[PDB]
Design an enzyme around this catalytic site. Structure first.
Site, PDB file in Angstrom:
ATOM      1  N   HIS B 350       0.675  -1.182  -0.156  1.00 54.18           N
ATOM      2  CA  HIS B 350       0.217  -0.029  -0.044  1.00 54.18           C
ATOM      3  C   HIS B 350       0.945   1.455   0.033  1.00 54.18           C
ATOM      4  O   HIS B 350       0.246   2.478   0.016  1.00 54.18           O
ATOM      5  CB  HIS B 350      -1.003   0.036   1.134  1.00 54.18           C
ATOM      6  CG  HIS B 350      -1.953  -0.916   1.163  1.00 54.18           C
ATOM      7  ND1 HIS B 350      -3.317  -0.829   0.673  1.00 54.18           N
ATOM      8  CD2 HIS B 350      -1.776  -2.370   1.815  1.00 54.18           C
ATOM      9  CE1 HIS B 350      -3.959  -2.123   0.756  1.00 54.18           C
ATOM     10  NE2 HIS B 350      -3.116  -2.926   1.466  1.00 54.18           N
ATOM     11  N   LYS B 541      -8.878  13.787   4.180  1.00 51.64           N
ATOM     12  CA  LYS B 541      -8.061  12.804   4.164  1.00 51.64           C
ATOM     13  C   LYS B 541      -7.092  13.058   5.321  1.00 51.64           C
ATOM     14  O   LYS B 541      -6.898  14.157   5.985  1.00 51.64           O
ATOM     15  CB  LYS B 541      -7.042  12.610   2.929  1.00 51.64           C
ATOM     16  CG  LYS B 541      -6.386  14.104   2.398  1.00 51.64           C
ATOM     17  CD  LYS B 541      -5.694  13.957   1.003  1.00 51.64           C
ATOM     18  CE  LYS B 541      -6.901  13.788  -0.145  1.00 51.64           C
ATOM     19  NZ  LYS B 541      -6.800  12.677  -0.888  1.00 51.64           N
ATOM     20  N   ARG B 542      -6.166  12.102   5.769  1.00 51.38           N
ATOM     21  CA  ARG B 542      -5.366  12.348   6.872  1.00 51.38           C
ATOM     22  C   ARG B 542      -4.307  13.352   6.447  1.00 51.38           C
ATOM     23  O   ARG B 542      -4.113  13.312   5.276  1.00 51.38           O
ATOM     24  CB  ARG B 542      -4.645  10.805   7.190  1.00 51.38           C
ATOM     25  CG  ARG B 542      -5.529   9.781   7.857  1.00 51.38           C
ATOM     26  CD  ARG B 542      -6.006  10.073   9.285  1.00 51.38           C
ATOM     27  NE  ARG B 542      -4.692  10.394  10.114  1.00 51.38           N
ATOM     28  CZ  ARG B 542      -4.312   9.174  11.106  1.00 51.38           C
ATOM     29  NH1 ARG B 542      -5.074   7.998  11.320  1.00 51.38           N
ATOM     30  NH2 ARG B 542      -3.283   9.459  11.621  1.00 51.38           N
ATOM     31  N   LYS B 547       0.536  14.369   0.952  1.00 55.43           N
ATOM     32  CA  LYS B 547      -0.767  14.912   0.330  1.00 55.43           C
ATOM     33  C   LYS B 547      -0.950  16.331   0.167  1.00 55.43           C
ATOM     34  O   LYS B 547      -2.053  16.719  -0.532  1.00 55.43           O
ATOM     35  CB  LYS B 547      -1.914  14.442   1.448  1.00 55.43           C
ATOM     36  CG  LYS B 547      -2.162  12.775   1.398  1.00 55.43           C
ATOM     37  CD  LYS B 547      -2.934  12.271   2.583  1.00 55.43           C
ATOM     38  CE  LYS B 547      -2.899  10.672   2.602  1.00 55.43           C
ATOM     39  NZ  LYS B 547      -3.864  10.109   1.768  1.00 55.43           N
ATOM     40  N   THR B 649      -8.528   6.501  -2.354  1.00 55.95           N
ATOM     41  CA  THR B 649      -9.986   5.802  -2.673  1.00 55.95           C
ATOM     42  C   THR B 649     -10.933   6.958  -2.305  1.00 55.95           C
ATOM     43  O   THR B 649     -12.091   7.011  -2.955  1.00 55.95           O
ATOM     44  CB  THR B 649     -10.193   4.630  -1.479  1.00 55.95           C
ATOM     45  OG1 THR B 649      -9.909   5.124  -0.443  1.00 55.95           O
ATOM     46  CG2 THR B 649      -9.347   3.452  -2.054  1.00 55.95           C
ATOM     47  N   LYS B 653     -14.750   8.121  -4.317  1.00 56.78           N
ATOM     48  CA  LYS B 653     -16.010   8.343  -3.563  1.00 56.78           C
ATOM     49  C   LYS B 653     -16.661   9.708  -3.879  1.00 56.78           C
ATOM     50  O   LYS B 653     -17.878   9.722  -4.071  1.00 56.78           O
ATOM     51  CB  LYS B 653     -15.837   8.552  -1.938  1.00 56.78           C
ATOM     52  CG  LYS B 653     -15.183   7.192  -1.263  1.00 56.78           C
ATOM     53  CD  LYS B 653     -14.726   7.551   0.255  1.00 56.78           C
ATOM     54  CE  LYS B 653     -13.922   6.330   0.416  1.00 56.78           C
ATOM     55  NZ  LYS B 653     -13.355   6.824   1.849  1.00 56.78           N
TER      56      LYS B 653
END
Ligand SMILES: OC[C@H]1O[C@@H](NC(=S)N/N=C/c2ccc(F)cc2)[C@H](O)[C@@H](O)[C@@H]1O
Ligand SMILES: OC[C@H]1O[C@@H](NC(=S)N/N=C/c2ccc(F)cc2)[C@H](O)[C@@H](O)[C@@H]1O
Ligand SMILES: OC[C@H]1O[C@@H](NC(=S)N/N=C/c2ccc(F)cc2)[C@H](O)[C@@H](O)[C@@H]1O
Ligand SMILES: OC[C@H]1O[C@@H](NC(=S)N/N=C/c2ccc(F)cc2)[C@H](O)[C@@H](O)[C@@H]1O
EC number: 2.4.1.1
Lengths: 809, 809
Positions: B350, B541-542, B547, B649, B653
């Protein structure tokens, strides 16, 4: 099968079967092909508990509408045992469930053995709380038991190589179907912090908070549709507690440790911080709950609507906590708050042994509960001012009566706190209550004689006759009807049957059946073989020097030595059974267990003895084991040194179940002998007065050793290693204590005890006369119902009338 | 009310109402006068769970009779969220329950908000496991999820003074109605000890034992009557554990700490002993359970009946544990055991970030798992012998490929262990799987190319469309029917409606309704006011540097500065929403949260800005919050540096729910743009190749600072204290990192990102064309169903065929 177990109607049996199957499916998620025996127990427990719900909701709604005075029974111990059969008995469902499970191809008695005891107590004090809850519900009182939901109850006892080993009693492992969590009534409890004085009074600030989450367990009365509540508190950390991150979450355990484990000391005081935290935790949460319920109804009316019973000094902090709330939070003046407190609280004492009394070091209270210490000091000052006014110039009385004990470490005497802050103080048997007035609380009795009362203990005849001995309950009901179950005095009617040949035969047959059943239980679960025709000589109770299991051991060895001396002489065969747990840190008690097993090791394998004498240690004595052994006993050993057993309640259980008693004139034994007649009791030994005379002269054990050859032989056998060949000096501590440091005068009662035991054997040779004496005991056991005890508390302390009336179904 | 929520028949509604009342009474012990809203939630949960029971029992019985190959999905995380609505959706009970509760005078949506999330995961990896379980049940696979029942899940995030605070997620406090304890399947797990070599092999002895107690949770498939199991293990001490007495009982907490808390690191590795214990605990218990089930059916057939999927390296100890059992306990020879192991195990990777890779110190494994270390050494030796044979003389390949990493502290590379011991290794998006073959596992790919696969991630359209966005599900079903819910490719049919005026209006209306609802949720629960006519710009998101929430912050400040420069110029109004948790020990992530709130503090109170720009930090982002915000979003921010987000992911969504995407060509964004068409996606920034080119030359942030005046202004504002007047140097760490130590090249994508954002604003000015592009996104979202993902795992890795067929009701 038998009448007292109720009706098994077609509609009831059908509905029970349907509901059992529904729970197996929807609740347990099983079908008959994969279901384990435990699954079947749970299905039945859910089926039975369903029957409590309507009655529980309406009982509580009834109290809300009628607003009676509420009774709060505060205890750190509730020794409940199993709940399934008790619930069936009180709801008249036993026969119906038996039929329903039989039709499903299951044995209900097998299912019952799966349930864990709720072992949330040590012995007599904890079991008393449980019998009391049963009686309060049966007598229709608006009563609540409040305690702690320990994650671990009294340890399970294993015997390894003759020694006690302890293991954790993980009684909640499979889940408890008898409780309902009540998270909406979660309350905060405060610890540590400091006291600030402001313009308008003291403030307790900078505290640490632990949450108290309640779990409710139903307490059903006997066939009256009353269901009362036992509310037990569990400790939970707040969510921001300690809030590197991982450790903070792991440290939540520190707060939650408060409700983790029951302290296993019986009549002994250990001043540990964790125990103090438990005592405050139960008191703080309970008092908030009480006050909340009272407001949802002016503190002048508080004592008219609330009674708090303190079960020993363990919840004594209720007195300064009530004062704290009334003075600091509600802003009442001191004198009014005090008046309310005294009229609300009552205190029951359970022992006179000095090492059992709670005396908390001041430094502990100073750190943990700073505001309570201040309140206690102020109580003491005002109390001592009253004493000084009543007894001018008596300076030694002042120091004797102080709540504060001076010395190396300053301590608070919690019993003095309880007396000062209660309107009623009671002992638990007539002789015990007299000893309190004459000796340890003499000064207090002189100041306030009206406070001192007696309330002789009792046991519930539901658990301790109907449940555990249905065979006896039935043969009684055949002659006198069923009313005696909630009116035990009716057993007097059995005196009319003392010469009745049919009744004599039936009483003796019921005992034989119980003995056969117990002999079978022993073989199956323990692989031990016993003669069911022998006299079953039983001493079961916690192991303590004062209870004198050692005196029993000396008798056992005497019998063995006599047999060995004259092997071919006839003796009445005995099975001597001794059982009970020892407090884990009590060395002498652990040595006593080892002695008992060591005696068994010699006696049970001696070919010359044969089947004439067997000595068995009953492992893991607990409520469910008591229900089995007590109905099987012929002889009840109640042999504490006079003046040491406050009451005893095991004694009453044996009396109700057809055993004769060998005992000293101690605790409730005195009243039992008075009820039955001294001719129908095997009394021996020193009275309290004789013990006093011996203490004044000085007790010299050597004198007895020198004058009794049979006693000297036993001591020589113990010393030389006769009972421990591989470790010759194993029992030197026991011998040394008996010879030089025996507080309980074992040798002084030895000769009288042995002679009395000879008279027991003599009577047992005559089965018909043995049984007639038994009938005379059962017939006069009425006084010892806890229904009588509770009716006296209600009328003489709480100011409420009991009611035998039904609530609507 | 709406069709996709199922039928509300008179018989069903009546029976639901009756069963709701039954549970309120018998289960919750309440009536309508005292019942709390939580009571009502529980009554409904019990009512719904009753419907699972028959299907659950028969599904498991079916697998027993048909004996299909079983799939075991091993994960340390299952991020389930709430269960009530999901269960109703999959059982077609939603409308019936809505009607039933309405007739009882209750709002079901209000009841749903009472349920706690099962937050047993951190982010994408944990949520993937949950979507996978849903898809495996829907596709009729005999699948079991195995994990740990953490007492505390991911922490609840509170924002205090703009800073993240953590609090314990005590999610089990009120009890979990969705689990069934299975104490009969309790198994022992061993730790520490030592290895003894005997005549017939190694023995692992002198171990400490912790018990693993399973709890089963149902996983219902979508309207196919399949109910699979998620089995989670809880740690329990044995009863003789540590068995002065009080402390021994208290120390049970040490063993039970194993299942206490979820480690909150996302893509970061902390070599803590407790985490290692968790990883072994789940593996040891799970493997015993698997073997037991396999025998109740010769290990040659083991891989024909068993597949184990390793969710990252966290359960990598399954490989040496399986070998241990096969060799030490079952007495198979090494080579046969190894063959069985490889054919049984498969591994999913992952991430490619080096700091996230598990490398366990040898000294830890030596102490905790001595036999496993020996087995790992032997695996390594045999593997390296294979490498040496294939690549003779390539000594550096040997050290690169070793499972044992040399250096200061010797470590075991768990990813190398997983590759060596698995028959299949997959990445989670096409670009990610390519990167694995080209870079970090290049050597392994060269040795065994057949092992390497791609399985692009997906999300379940049950939770992520039907459940969270019923309005959208309904307008789709109106045109194309209901079949698309379990066959998402059918959404392609919507391309026929891209010019349909009615559909355009309905799509836009559904979005507006969702935005209005979310604007209302914000005001009520948080007292924050937003313009519902603005563009909803969402990044949830975290929090992580890769990110690039920071890149988003720079854009926000750019927009604010432009407004301040030309206040009277029109700009498309935006509500910029950023949410996500930071790992508690990740300082930079915590500073990023503070920056976001600090920007909001300036922007939201500037009178000149007005309602044209608002910046909101969404507190406590979790599954239940995602279900609310995602349907409301217009713009999805997916802006990770190319090559860093393995898949994503959250991206999928947003696509399914009618938001357009602004994103880099990273992870699954590449495949999303390929499905929809590049014209229908807002793509910007460096590709992987461009990042590589920059790294070779060296990344110099100063260059961008020197050439972009708008960027220089922002850095000057941050440095000077414009966003923190009382603490001028608050953000110096952020500035320093951006200027000198930025691994993720924030400045390099800045210019392209801002320009791309201008094109987003341009399109949003034209509502009709905005919506047509949306329709083109929804219509091509089919590939990203986890049903597609799981069908590929099933066919290409597990060797089983999925089935859309119903089991009998
Ligand atoms: O058995 C598992 C769980 O059961 C729960 N009880 C619930 S849901 N209803 N009880 C209703 C009830 C009805 C009649 C009674 F006479 C007692 C309880 C307990 O709150 C929980 O602490 C326990 O672990
Ligand atoms: O009134 C009921 C019975 O009370 C008994 N007292 C008991 S069990 N005290 N335990 C005290 C204790 C102290 C510390 C603890 F951590 C636990 C228990 C009396 O000995 C007995 O004669 C009487 O029949
Ligand atoms: O809710 C309180 C307790 O509930 C218990 N469950 C029991 S008794 N039956 N469940 C049956 C069930 C039926 C259908 C389902 F879809 C799930 C569970 C749990 O074992 C326990 O850990 C929990 O604390
Ligand atoms: O495949 C599903 C998703 O997996 C994600 N990985 C995550 S959440 N790893 N957590 C690792 C972790 C490490 C230590 C822990 F204690 C907890 C979690 C990827 O970043 C994402 O691109 C992908 O979409």
């Amino acid at each position: 099968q038998i009448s007292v177990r109720g009706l098994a109607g077609v509609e009831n049996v059908t509905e029970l079967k349907k509901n059992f199957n529904r729970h197996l499916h929807f609740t347990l998620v099983k079908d008959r092909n994969v279901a384990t025996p435990r699954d079947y127990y749970f299905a039945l427990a859910h089926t039975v508990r369903d029957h409590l719900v309507g009655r529980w909701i309406r009982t509580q709604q009834h109290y809300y509408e009628k607003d009676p005075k509420r009774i709060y029974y505060l205890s750190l111990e509730f020794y409940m045992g199993r709940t399934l059969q008790n619930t069936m008995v009180n709801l008249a469902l036993e026969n119906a469930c038996d039929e329903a499970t039989y039709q499903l191809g299951l044995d209900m008695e097998e299912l019952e053995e799966i349930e864990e005891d709720a072992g949330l107590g040590n012995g007599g004090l904890g079991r008393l709380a449980a019998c009391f809850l049963d009686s309060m519900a049966t007598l229709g009182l608006a009563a609540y038991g409040y305690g702690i939901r320990y994650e671990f109850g009294i340890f399970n006892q294993k015997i390894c190589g003759g020694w006690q080993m302890e293991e954790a009693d993980d009684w909640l492992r499979y889940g408890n179907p008898w409780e309902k969590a009540r998270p909406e009534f979660t309350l905060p409890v405060h610890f540590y912090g400091r006291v600030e004085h402001t313009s308008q009074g003291a403030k307790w600030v900078d505290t640490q908070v632990v949450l108290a989450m309640p779990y409710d367990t139903p307490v059903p009365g006997y066939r009256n549709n009353v269901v009362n509540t036992m509310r037990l508190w569990s400790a939970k950390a707040p969510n921001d507690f300690n809030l590197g991150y991982i450790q903070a979450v792991l440290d939540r355990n520190l707060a939650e440790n408060i409700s983790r484990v029951l302290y296993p000391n019986d009549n002994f005081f250990e001043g540990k911080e964790l125990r103090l935290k438990q005592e405050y935790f139960v008191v703080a949460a309970t008092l908030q709950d009480i006050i909340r319920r009272f407001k949802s109804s002016n503190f002048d009316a508080f004592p008219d609507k609330v009674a708090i019973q303190l079960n020993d000094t363990h919840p004594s902090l209720a007195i300064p906590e009530l004062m704290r709330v009334l003075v600091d939070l509600e802003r009442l003046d001191w004198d009014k708050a005090w008046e309310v407190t005294v009229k609300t609280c009552a205190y029951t004492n359970h022992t006179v042994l000095p090492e059992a009394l709670e005396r908390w070091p001041v430094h502990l209270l100073e750190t943990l509960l700073p505001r309570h210490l201040q309140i206690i000091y102020e109580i003491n000052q005002r109390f001592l001012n009253r004493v000084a006014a009543a007894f001018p110039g008596d300076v030694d009385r002042l120091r004797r009566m102080s709540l504060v004990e001076e010395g190396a470490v300053k301590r608070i005497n919690m019993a003095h706190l309880c007396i000062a802050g209660s309107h009623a103080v009671n002992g638990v048997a007539r002789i015990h209550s007299e000893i309190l007035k004459k000796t340890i609380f003499k000064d207090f009795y002189e100041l306030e004689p009206h406070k001192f009362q007696n309330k002789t203990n009792g046991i519930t005849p539901r658990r301790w006759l109907v449940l555990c001995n249905p065979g006896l309950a039935e043969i009684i009901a055949e002659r006198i009807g069923e009313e005696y179950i909630s009116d035990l005095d009716q057993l007097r009617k059995l005196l009319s049957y003392v010469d009745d040949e049919a009744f004599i035969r039936d009483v003796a047959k019921v005992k034989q059946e119980n003995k056969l059943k117990f002999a079978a239980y022993l073989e199956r679960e323990y692989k031990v073989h016993i003669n069911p025709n022998s006299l079953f000589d039983v001493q079961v109770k916690r192991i303590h020097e004062y209870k004198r299991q050692l005196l029993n051991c000396l008798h056992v060895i005497t019998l063995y030595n006599r047999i060995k001396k004259e092997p071919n002489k006839f003796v009445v065969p005995r099975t001597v059974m001794i059982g009970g747990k020892a407090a884990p840190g009590y060395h002498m008690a652990k040595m006593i267990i080892k002695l008992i097993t060591a005696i068994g090791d010699v006696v049970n394998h001696d070919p010359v003895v044969g089947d004439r004498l067997r000595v068995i240690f009953l492992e893991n004595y607990r409520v469910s084991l008591a229900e089995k052994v007590i109905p099987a006993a012929d002889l009840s050993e109640q042999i504490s040194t006079a003046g040491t057993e406050a009451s005893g309640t095991g004694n009453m259980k044996f009396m109700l179940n057809g055993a004769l008693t060998i005992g000293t004139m101690d605790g409730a034994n005195v009243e039992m002998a008075e009820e039955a007649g001294e001719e129908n009791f095997f009394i021996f030994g020193m009275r309290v007065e004789d013990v006093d005379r011996l203490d004044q002269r000085g007790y010299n054990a050597q004198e007895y050793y020198d004058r009794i050859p049979e006693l000297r032989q036993i001591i020589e056998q113990l010393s030389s290693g006769f009972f421990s060949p591989k470790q010759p000096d194993l029992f030197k501590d026991i011998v040394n204590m008996l010879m030089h440091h025996d507080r309980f005068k074992v040798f002084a009662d030895y000769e009288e005890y042995v002679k009395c035991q000879e008279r027991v054997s003599a009577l047992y040779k005559n089965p018909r006369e043995w049984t007639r004496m038994v009938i005379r005991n059962i017939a006069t056991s009425g006084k010892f119902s806890s229904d009588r005890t509770i009716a006296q508390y209600a009328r003489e302390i709480w100011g409420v009338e009991p009611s035998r009336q039904r609530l609507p179904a």
